[PDB]
């Protein structure tokens, strides 16, 4: 019932007790592990609220206080009357920071307590959402000196008045299927792009077209907006030794900003809650650039390096991969945009994990997602046993809005 | 029940029904996943159902399920169990069992080869000397002058747990590790504890960086005995690099034959505590883990220096760069010496084809993503993008405690 995790490189053993408070389910059973699967009422609401306020009030050294009892009282009353309840600003900020703290797939959690929370619960229109998102983008970007931020739109009421950001990230590049059968731009975004077009976007059919925002307010029909180009900081990718690399015409955006997830706090559901930090290099250079179903540029780079691509055993793919990733880090650093390499980031996570075990009794972690997509075993996380479990507050996946939207 | 896995690179969806035959437990629950945890004397009572389940599998596989031969064999085993408290496998059942333990090994990326396994029956063995002879023969056969052949040698099964056969080596061939008084390590840091045992047992250590360890062999629960594998049977490969001429002067080599010797083979409820098995290497096993783990030979720094990479900041990716060149060298050296090896691209690609064939023909393929994905360049191999389902099937290979921790010393 008390669980040990071992680091096989250092022999350090930590004991996890935090998992005992987990409430949500993993998909795993006694007979089968689904660790590698990507996606595995008034009565309902009050224990959830209670669970949350209890941890909130415990966190501020005020457990079992009148103020605690008073709040529990008040929320209880409000749920009976209104069927829901409103979070105090303090609780909202706590909840959002803890949702990030609890994100078992996030390697960057050492930063969890330093999150700028933008309260957008007063928002009523897609123009309003556009304004809040531009402000988030400008704040987070901070001229290349990135700051973590989350903007929180109104909570779900009856699921009929959902606020949604239709984009999967605030900043992404469009993708277009050609007659040539090939794919222009980012293949991950073909379907969303067509939705934009079908809603009236005038695509400039390029290879790196910043997608417009498709914003849905109050369960209404989603509207289109273009982020001011001056607020979208982008980085041309060059290599510090290969002069030809710039000729590939590659660029990427500075701000990673997830916008399709759902924030759950004290049973309340925030379906529109865009959040952003800064990139780890491999996200762009390994996944975005080299994934076969993405920009998939390994072959071109390999050719320009004049590698023997006859046999897999020359490791030409691996060689190109390292260089591409060298160029990404080099390009961001050179333009003074915050980025972190996978060595630094995983090293930071090990120390965070130790802090969490030391000060919280554990740290939920998904090894499959925490270990970087290159050079896995030369990073300390590869050798670190991890326990994965779900705590709340949390960020959750939710269905793409277009499959669910009664137009 | 049906379970689907998706490949996020191809959108190929597979459906698993085999997991319904899973008997043993994972360590995971509805509330926690222990997928990254490395490690999470039977009564007649429990033994016959295990025998029966195994024999039903075996007879189905040969399309004789429910036959008189099937029925007679169940009867024969039942009687042998109730009179002798255990039973003996037929040679056919032993071979089937050992192949299926490999087929079922969810952490093994090389399973496309599972049906090609040479099984050496060493169940008539009685002494450590006899074990030494069997193991020498296995090494020679498996090595095959560099044209490696998979093999397994199976020693007598457990009886009362007081007469176990054990190979104390974790692998048949490994290099000594020596802890120095200054705290530095000579040789392979992984093998320091076992090296010290060997020394205590009377081994005269040459004390170099690549000393092949003696075999420490335990027959019938007796105290283990030391033997040196004849050097002529130990095939090694000097490591050099195709473009970098200074790489040879690093003084590296490795052995050709990976042969795991510390696991337990379970077949039909019977326990084979000594069952060394061998295949051939995937390059990263040596070039990534053996050479570049901080807790192993740990050569990234020296290599990176000699390449004159910028080592002042991790962001130069000097470690990643040196790591690739080392792995190129390992592959180059083995290929140049005509010793069987497979790169992580070939091996994972073959595994995906194997896995898909298994889903279609068997209803599933249990697989441990954490172990299947190679320790470098993960997402540029197809297994990274493949969802997998991990579950336990028997026959199986299991971990067992290290014998020095449990052995009752005779003296
Ligand atoms: C500040 C620097 C940050 C770094 C370096 C970082 C790093 C990462 C990385 C590498 C991933 C894996 C993503 C992928 O492979 O697709 C990830 C996932 C994730 N991050 Fe962080 N992150 C940061 C900030 C944040 C913040 C501020 C939040 C929330 C407030 C957050 C929440 C999450 C969540 C929920 C996931 C999982 C998404 C999913 O399940 O697909 N991260 N992070
Ligand atoms: C023929 C070529 C083979 C290749 C290329 C191969 C490859 C691998 C690799 C790379 C691993 C991961 C080991 C590690 O990272 O420490 C592994 C594990 C394993 N292999 Fe294979 N293998 C082969 C043959 C075999 C054979 C013949 C057997 C048994 C008859 C076998 C059974 C296993 C088992 C039980 C494990 C898990 C060991 C553990 O959990 O520590 N393999 N294999
Ligand atoms: C976009 O929502 C789904 C989450 N997934 C799968 C996803 C797909 N591509 C990129 C990201 C971005 C992950 C991410 C998020 C943040 C906040 C920082 C950072 N460095 N990285 C997430
Ligand atoms: C040695 O006991 C197993 C423990 N582990 C994880 C372990 C440690 N070092 C090397 C191996 C070798 C695994 C292995 C086995 C076989 C048969 C072929 C191959 N290519 N690789 C396994
Ligand atoms: C903690 C973690 O489970 C451990 O480091 C595992 C990870 N994956 C692995 N994968 C392989 N093939 N071999 C290993 O030794 C390990 N080690
Ligand atoms: C099938 C597998 O779960 C899938 O490829 C996962 C593996 N690990 C990952 N890890 C991260 N960080 N991001 C990902 O998108 C994935 N994809
Ligand atoms: Zn699991």
Curated annotation (Swiss-Prot), chain B:
Changing residue 281 to F: what effect?
A: No decrease in nitric-oxide synthase activity
Residue numbers binding L-arginine: 171, 280-281, 285
Positions bound to (6R)-L-erythro-5,6,7,8-tetrahydrobiopterin: 36, 370-371, 384
What sections of the sequence does the record tag as coiled-coil?
none
Q: Which of this chain's residues are annotated to bind heme b? A: 108, 399
PTM comment text: Ubiquitinated; mediated by STUB1/CHIP in the presence of Hsp70 and Hsp40 (in vitro).
Name the tissues where it is expressed: Isoform N-NOS-1 is expressed in brain and colorectum. Found in the Auerbach's plexus of the enteric nervous system. Isoform PNNOS is expressed in the penis, urethra, prostate, and skeletal muscle, and coexists with the cerebellar nnos in the pelvic plexus, bladder and liver, and is detectable in the cerebellum.
Subcellular location, record wording = Cell membrane, Sarcolemma; Cell projection, Dendritic spine
Q: Which domain of life is it from?
A: Eukaryota
Give the domain note.
The PDZ domain participates in protein-protein interaction, and is responsible for targeting nNos to synaptic membranes. Mediates interaction with VAC14.
User: Into which family does the record put it?
Assistant: Belongs to the NOS family.
Q: Function, please?
A: Produces nitric oxide (NO) which is a messenger molecule with diverse functions throughout the body. In the brain and peripheral nervous system, NO displays many properties of a neurotransmitter. Inhibitory transmitter for non-adrenergic and non-cholinergic nerves in the colorectum. Probably has nitrosylase activity and mediates cysteine S-nitrosylation of cytoplasmic target proteins such SRR. Inhibitory transmitter for non-adrenergic and non-cholinergic nerves in the colorectum.
What interactions and quaternary structure are annotated? Homodimer. Interacts with DLG4 (via N-terminal tandem pair of PDZ domains); the interaction possibly being prevented by the association between NOS1 and CAPON. Forms a ternary complex with CAPON and RASD1. Forms a ternary complex with CAPON and SYN1. Interacts with ZDHHC23. Interacts with NOSIP; which may impair its synaptic location. Interacts with HTR4. Interacts with SLC6A4. Interacts with VAC14.
Q: What is this protein called?
A: Nitric oxide synthase 1
| Native organism | Rattus norvegicus
């Amino acid at each position: 019932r008390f669980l040990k995790v071992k680091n096989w490189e250092t022999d350090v053993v930590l004991t996890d007790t935090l998992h005992l408070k987990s409430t949500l389910e993993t998909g795993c059973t006694e007979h089968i592990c689904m660790g590698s699967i990507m996606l595995p009422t008034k009565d309902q609401l009050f224990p959830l609220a209670k669970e949350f306020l209890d941890q909130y009030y415990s966190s501020i050294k005020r457990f079992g206080s009148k103020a605690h009892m008073d709040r529990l009282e008040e929320v209880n009353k409000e749920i009976e009357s209104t069927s829901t309840y409103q979070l105090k600003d303090t609780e909202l900020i706590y909840g959002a920071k803890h949702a990030w703290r609890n994100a078992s797939r996030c390697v960057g959690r050492i930063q969890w307590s330093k999150l700028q929370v933008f309260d957008a619960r007063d928002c009523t229109t897609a123009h309003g959402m556009f304004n809040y998102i531009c402000n988030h983008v400008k704040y987070a970007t901070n001229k290349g000196n990135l700051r973590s931020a989350i903007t929180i739109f109104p909570q779900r009421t009856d699921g009929k008045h959902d606020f949604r950001v239709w984009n999967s990230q605030l900043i992404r590049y469009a993708g277009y299927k050609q007659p040539d059968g090939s794919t222009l731009g980012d293949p991950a975004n073909v379907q969303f792009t067509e939705i934009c077009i079908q809603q009236g976007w005038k695509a400039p059919r390029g290879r790196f077209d910043v997608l417009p925002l498709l914003l849905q307010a109050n369960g209404n029909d989603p509207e289109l907006f273009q982020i001011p180009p001056e607020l979208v900081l982008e980085v041309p990718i060059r290599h510090p030794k290969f002069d030809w690399f710039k000729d590939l015409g590659l660029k990427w955006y500075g701000l990673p900003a997830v916008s399709n997830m759902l924030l759950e706090i004290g049973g309340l559901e925030f379906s529109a809650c865009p959040f952003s930090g800064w990139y780890m290099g491999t996200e762009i250079g390994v996944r975005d650039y080299c994934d076969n179903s993405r920009y998939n540029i390994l072959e071109e780079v390999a050719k320009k390096m004049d590698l023997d691509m006859r046999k897999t055993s020359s490791l030409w793919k691996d060689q190109a991969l390292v260089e591409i990733n060298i160029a990404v880090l080099y390009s961001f650093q050179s333009d003074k945009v915050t980025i972190v390499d996978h060595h630094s980031a995983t090293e930071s996570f090990i120390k965070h994990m130790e802090n969490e075990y030391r000060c919280r009794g554990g740290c939920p972690a998904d090894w499959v997602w925490i270990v970087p997509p290159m050079s896995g075993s030369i990073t300390p996380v590869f050798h670190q046993e991890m326990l994965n479990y779900r705590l709340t507050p949390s960020f959750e996946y939710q269905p793409d809005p277009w499959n669910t939207h009664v137009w």
